[PDB]
Amino acid sequence: MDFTMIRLVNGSGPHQGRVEVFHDRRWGTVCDDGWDKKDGDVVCRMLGFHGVEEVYRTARFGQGTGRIWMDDVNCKGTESSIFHCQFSKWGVTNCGHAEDAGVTCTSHH
């Protein structure tokens, strides 16, 4: 049910870009604090890609706007949905959009 609430925005394709999640009525970004390959793997597999090619910090794919919804995302790397990962409370971050996390997933075009 969670695969709908996550998109990769502003990449070369829907397999890559700034991570945006849908929560409480609106799209919001994810902070890079502790953004690593475990989290990237979780995000890329909940969307249907076989693996993660790369994670990016410091708004690799430009700065989102509006709400940063997640911070301190600490996935084990095994999860079915990013929201099953340990992370901040919704909307409680110590970040700015300059820190919006991005990813590139494994894709075969």
Ligand SMILES: *[C@@H]1O[C@H](CO)[C@@H](O)[C@H](O)[C@H]1NC(C)=O
């Ligand atoms: C992502 O889009 C933003 C503006 O929406 C832009 O500043 C940035 O350069 C883009 N990233 C790439 C890799 O083109």
Ligand SMILES: [Ca+2]
């Ligand atoms: Ca940071």
Ligand SMILES: [Ca+2]
């Ligand atoms: Ca933080």
Ligand SMILES: [Ca+2]
């Ligand atoms: Ca992490």
